[PDB]
Amino acid sequence: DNIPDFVKETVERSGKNPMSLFSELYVHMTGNTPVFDFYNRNQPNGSMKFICVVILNGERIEGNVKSKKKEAKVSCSLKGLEVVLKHVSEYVVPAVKFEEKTTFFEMLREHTYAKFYELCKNNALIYGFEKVIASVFLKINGNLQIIALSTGNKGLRGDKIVNDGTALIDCHAEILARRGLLRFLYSEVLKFSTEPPNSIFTKGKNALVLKPGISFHLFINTAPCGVARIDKKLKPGTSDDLQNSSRLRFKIDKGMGTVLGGASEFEAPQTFDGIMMGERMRTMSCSDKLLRANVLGVQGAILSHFIDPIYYSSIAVAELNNADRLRKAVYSRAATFKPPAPFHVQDVEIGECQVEDTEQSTSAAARSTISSMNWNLADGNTEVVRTSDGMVHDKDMSGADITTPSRLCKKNMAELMITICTLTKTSVDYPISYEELKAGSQEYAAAKKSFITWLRQKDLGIWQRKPREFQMFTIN
Amino acid sequence: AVKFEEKTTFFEMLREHTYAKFYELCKNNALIYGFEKVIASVFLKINGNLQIIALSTGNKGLRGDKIVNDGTALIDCHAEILARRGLLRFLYSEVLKFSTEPPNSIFTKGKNALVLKPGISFHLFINTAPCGVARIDKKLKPGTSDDLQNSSRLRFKIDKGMGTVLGGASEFEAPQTFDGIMMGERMRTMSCSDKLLRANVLGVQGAILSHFIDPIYYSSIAVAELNNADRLRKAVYSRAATFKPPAPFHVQDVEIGECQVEARSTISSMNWNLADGNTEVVRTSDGMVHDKDMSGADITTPSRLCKKNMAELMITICTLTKTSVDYPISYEELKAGSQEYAAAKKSFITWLRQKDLGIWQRKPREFQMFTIN
Amino acid sequence: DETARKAATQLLDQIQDTPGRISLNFETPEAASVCPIPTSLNQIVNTKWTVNQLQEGQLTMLLAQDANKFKSLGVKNIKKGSVETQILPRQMDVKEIVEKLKKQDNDSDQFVGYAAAVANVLRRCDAETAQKITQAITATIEKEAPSIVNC
Amino acid sequence: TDETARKAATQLLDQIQDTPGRISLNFETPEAASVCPIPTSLNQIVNTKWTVNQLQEGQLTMLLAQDANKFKSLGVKNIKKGSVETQILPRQMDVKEIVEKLKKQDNDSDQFVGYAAAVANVLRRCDAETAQKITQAITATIEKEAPSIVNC
Ligand SMILES: O=P(O)(O)O[C@H]1[C@@H](OP(=O)(O)O)[C@@H](OP(=O)(O)O)[C@@H](OP(=O)(O)O)[C@@H](OP(=O)(O)O)[C@H]1OP(=O)(O)O
Ligand SMILES: O=P(O)(O)O[C@H]1[C@@H](OP(=O)(O)O)[C@@H](OP(=O)(O)O)[C@@H](OP(=O)(O)O)[C@@H](OP(=O)(O)O)[C@H]1OP(=O)(O)O
Numbered sequence A: 001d002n003i004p005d006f007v008k009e010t011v012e013r014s015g016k017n018p019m020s021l022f023s024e025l026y027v028h029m030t031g032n033t034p035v036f037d038f039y040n041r042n043q044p045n046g047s048m049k050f051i052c053v054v055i056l057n058g059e060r061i062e063g064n065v066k067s068k069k070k071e072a073k074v075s076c077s078l079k080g081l082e083v084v085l086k087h088v089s090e091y092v093v094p095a096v097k098f099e100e101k102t103t104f105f106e107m108l109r110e111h112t113y114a115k116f117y118e119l120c121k122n123n124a125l126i127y128g129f130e131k132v133i134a135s136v137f138l139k140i141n142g143n144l145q146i147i148a149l150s151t152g153n154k155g156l157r158g159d160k161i162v163n164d165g166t167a168l169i170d171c172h173a174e175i176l177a178r179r180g181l182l183r184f185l186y187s188e189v190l191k192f193s194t195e196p197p198n199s200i201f202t203k204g205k206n207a208l209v210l211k212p213g214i215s216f217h218l219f220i221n222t223a224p225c226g227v228a229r230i231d232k233k234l235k236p237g238t239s240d241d242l243q244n245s246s247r248l249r250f251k252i253d254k255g256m257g258t259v260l261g262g263a264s265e266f267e268a269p270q271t272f273d274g275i276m277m278g279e280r281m282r283t284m285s286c287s288d289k290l291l292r293a294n295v296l297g298v299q300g301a302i303l304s305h306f307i308d309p310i311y312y313s314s315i316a317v318a319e320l321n322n323a324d325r326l327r328k329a330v331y332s333r334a335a336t337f338k339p340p341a342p343f344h345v346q347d348v349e350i351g352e353c354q355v356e357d358t359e360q361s362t363s364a365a366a367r368s369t370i371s372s373m374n375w376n377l378a379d380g381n382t383e384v385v386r387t388s389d390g391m392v393h394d395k396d397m398s399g400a401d402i403t404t405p406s407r408l409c410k411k412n413m414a415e416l417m418i419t420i421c422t423l424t425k426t427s428v429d430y431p432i433s434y435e436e437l438k439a440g441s442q443e444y445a446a447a448k449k450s451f452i453t454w455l456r457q458k459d460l461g462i463w464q465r466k467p468r469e470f471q472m473f474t475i476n
Numbered sequence B: 001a002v003k004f005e006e007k008t009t010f011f012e013m014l015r016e017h018t019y020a021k022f023y024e025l026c027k028n029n030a031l032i033y034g035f036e037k038v039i040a041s042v043f044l045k046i047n048g049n050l051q052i053i054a055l056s057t058g059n060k061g062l063r064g065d066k067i068v069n070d071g072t073a074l075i076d077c078h079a080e081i082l083a084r085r086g087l088l089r090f091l092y093s094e095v096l097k098f099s100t101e102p103p104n105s106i107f108t109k110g111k112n113a114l115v116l117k118p119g120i121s122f123h124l125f126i127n128t129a130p131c132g133v134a135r136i137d138k139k140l141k142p143g144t145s146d147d148l149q150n151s152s153r154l155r156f157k158i159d160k161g162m163g164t165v166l167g168g169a170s171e172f173e174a175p176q177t178f179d180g181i182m183m184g185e186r187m188r189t190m191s192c193s194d195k196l197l198r199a200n201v202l203g204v205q206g207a208i209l210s211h212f213i214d215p216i217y218y219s220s221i222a223v224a225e226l227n228n229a230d231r232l233r234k235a236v237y238s239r240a241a242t243f244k245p246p247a248p249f250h251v252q253d254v255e256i257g258e259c260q261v262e263a264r265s266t267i268s269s270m271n272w273n274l275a276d277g278n279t280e281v282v283r284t285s286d287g288m289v290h291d292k293d294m295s296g297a298d299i300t301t302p303s304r305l306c307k308k309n310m311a312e313l314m315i316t317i318c319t320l321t322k323t324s325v326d327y328p329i330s331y332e333e334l335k336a337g338s339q340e341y342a343a344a345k346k347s348f349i350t351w352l353r354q355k356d357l358g359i360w361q362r363k364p365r366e367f368q369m370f371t372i373n
Numbered sequence C: 001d002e003t004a005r006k007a008a009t010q011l012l013d014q015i016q017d018t019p020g021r022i023s024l025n026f027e028t029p030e031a032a033s034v035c036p037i038p039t040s041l042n043q044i045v046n047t048k049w050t051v052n053q054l055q056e057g058q059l060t061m062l063l064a065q066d067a068n069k070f071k072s073l074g075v076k077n078i079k080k081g082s083v084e085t086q087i088l089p090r091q092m093d094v095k096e097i098v099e100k101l102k103k104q105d106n107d108s109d110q111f112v113g114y115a116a117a118v119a120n121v122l123r124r125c126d127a128e129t130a131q132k133i134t135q136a137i138t139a140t141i142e143k144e145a146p147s148i149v150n151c
Numbered sequence D: 001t002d003e004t005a006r007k008a009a010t011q012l013l014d015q016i017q018d019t020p021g022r023i024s025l026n027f028e029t030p031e032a033a034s035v036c037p038i039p040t041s042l043n044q045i046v047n048t049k050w051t052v053n054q055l056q057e058g059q060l061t062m063l064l065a066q067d068a069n070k071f072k073s074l075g076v077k078n079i080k081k082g083s084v085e086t087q088i089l090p091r092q093m094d095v096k097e098i099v100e101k102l103k104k105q106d107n108d109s110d111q112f113v114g115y116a117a118a119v120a121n122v123l124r125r126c127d128a129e130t131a132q133k134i135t136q137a138i139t140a141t142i143e144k145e146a147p148s149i150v151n152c
């Protein structure tokens, strides 16, 4: 063929058509936008032709001479894509931060992007995913190491829901960062099982506890969706607007924003069949999920069988003026809640980055992307998940898509926990299900129930729980 | 200037009087010069006596990043819509006039609500064809096969742009969200052709004013461009003639008229109202009134036509007429309080969806959750 | 047409004399034909109300008045719970609807697709036709499924 | 700016590029500590033997590669738990009274979700032949009652 197969490979794997892919890659390679030179060829009997010639990297990328502008320009785009994949190189960012100020969170901002671009070196297909990106860092005595890294701003479609837990439900960046943190915590539990000195855990009174000084810090390159975003308006509001601007919100599969609920509105539980019949699945907003994280811990229900609750010590958002309303949304809405005993409402430190208000990038061409990467230190490799169905789409030897569950899905988390239980000789019931395993954490279940009940009784709203059949699958 | 009589010159008379009134206003305030590129007006007619009661200019809308949650910003500043809003303020003034001088008002105590005195009718004039279905697309091809149906579907205005886009796209299936709109999602506002259809179905009075008065309908719509009467009639009446709204409402068969007489994208817009009697200029980008002092500063005031101002006027009306209204109620609940209008609007939107005309693009609930006191 | 010219000039002069107000000359067929208003709006009423009841600043002058001058109107503007739901279903293509109506391996999909297609067909269906479809479906289900749903 | 502070700042910026994802703040000089001040609540200086170098990329993959003999017990017990109801194997096959009500019920402001769910439920439990013969009847009824919807 006159066009290299790598052009088709890039077009297919990037999820972008050749014209859009050429437009994107020309802008990422040089400082200009493709312009087509409409040359014409005349036959002796009279004819009109177009070539739509584009010049790039000093190479003549003259396309096929054809009747109209469309086919000639798309052929020139194909050849220009051949050119951009030739001369192997890609855009990178040097550090541009300021010092001596409150730049610790800015240190977290640069190291998140710097780590992401390092991953792009080994896997070129994740380029451009960093428009919406979150990461988790582990700190001890001034030493910080990135733990989890993820992108994405979209959720599972209602058509693609499954009862076996193989699909990622919410592929927002911070949620996937928390899931990568969960995988890292599982790895650390295993390490404590084999090498207690080298692990971050130590034997507490009733469960594993973090060694002193070890902290976890969440960074998000944009404000989490929900009331942490709805409060961008600096005007304080009048009276009832304060309570109105603090109620729970839920997400739509693809909506870039969130929808406020009501006072006993949406009290009817979601049903699996309803979502399949066409009802839009409701997922709690990332602001409410972060409030839940700072009330109940980030470790989740399953890890509570091994470890004591773990909380984010700080949450950083790449916005210049976010300290007040992010803190309100993330901590203050439940500051008066009293969890049962192992848990507490974490007074998370709120940090602001500098240099760039990142939401310029998060709002441009980030709506188009439908796939999300996730990286964590425990696995050490990147993974791309198509957010529409929330599962990994690899390429077969003979073509067509083969689709496999992500490592962050419910089934894989349950399998990892069962593997740890087998290795550490922990006795578990054979016929348990995913829901029964999570319900097994008595203290965590009680704390979650009390938190939901308190949110209801304080008029904050109704927590939009998923249908029970999302989690009835048996692991063993 | 001058045009030939002996013809169907009633609508040309409307056009001439609208332009004369606008230029009379421009004499009093020269800042509004040049706004008449897209102008609309509402006339009140009794027997052979005609009087202009509302007037407006403008062909743009609110920007997505300038939205507010307290209802102080104008969402759509197209000339047709602001003419209806000025008519709303005029109708408020007439309700108050009835509450004190029943003989001197246009309203009369009906069976269960105020009704117009016999012979009183309202007529809408527009400088150009309303955006959407009523306005012919210079692109594509004349309606054939499936595109014939698309010649009658609902169209949405798009902020930070011009023209109306068709529905049914993958992005337009999802509901509008306040945070989504403000951070960069395109805010969808229904086109003037579909808004005129809603005006012909549920009336021009709106939900809040429907508490006191019976539905009020345009008796005629006049547009200053010819060879398009049938297209305008299809947009505003025909594509909903089969709809059967609840008892107090009906689909008005407006009389479409063409005037004898057959470019600029200025940011500001103006509106005039007989009830107020004074012109008002708003900035269409943010839908707010901008003034100045000591030859500087950017003092900004909500428009008289905004949701908050309409609610305040409504509450003042209720106070003067001693009408009992709940104290903690909000704008969203006040509009929903009118049972008949809410049911009719819900039925109309459902009917539009079922007969495959499109999904009516309702604004996020946060646009109207502000309380009134 | 001498008086037709008179009426035409009177109407033309009226745009400069009292802009925004039109007073057509009725009760004279030759002068009435100068600006023939359309028959759809040609209703003449002997009502005592006239255009002169309308003047600029109407609302401002009414607001700045004693509160004792306003009589009672309709009462009890009671709130109503705004419909909380967004567009509740997801739309799907009619071509996709027909595709799931004809597939017969649906037992592999656990019959979810067929029911979703039926729901989407019924959602875009008018109330009477939807009621008839529901009745027919229930009747044919009862006919062919005794001891399963029928009792 | 002091030479030591500038040196510490340049070291931090260079470490951004040299070892992405790893941050090593410097405390042996209070001037150097002023370059990147940690929040006072986040400082929490504690003497410890653990170091950040104990974290290796892909540690989970290597850890699972070891045989089970090197893993010691954590000293815990895991027991399932009260999941509400059994709402038997999915509150899917819902009790026959619910489908009887849903099929009978007329007010479908629910947007036909419940009725279609009931239709699916009764369809599933019928045998292959019965369910097969019902579906053509349903398709035919849809096609004959509302041709404009389906045959367009
Ligand atoms: O990490 P997320 O994607 O936000 O998932 C969480 C998580 O589910 P996983 O079990 O998948 O981690 C929760 O579980 P906990 O670990 O906190 O117990 C919880 O699940 P439950 O409350 O049901 O135990 C919740 O789900 P729900 O939506 O039901 O509140 C939610 O899942 P979603 O992503 O589905 O929101
Ligand atoms: O003057 P418009 O711009 O056409 O405003 C209307 C109006 O809203 P307000 O009168 O409150 O400004 C409508 O309300 P009704 O008076 O007809 O009840 C309606 O609002 P509802 O649907 O809530 O009734 C609609 O808004 P929507 O787009 O949500 O349909 C629309 O507002 P916009 O054109 O400004 O969107």
Ligand SMILES: [Zn+2]
Binding pocket: A172, A173, A224, A225, A285, A286, A287
């Ligand atoms: Zn989110």
Ligand SMILES: [Zn+2]
Binding pocket: B078, B079, B080, B130, B131, B191, B192, B193
């Ligand atoms: Zn318009």
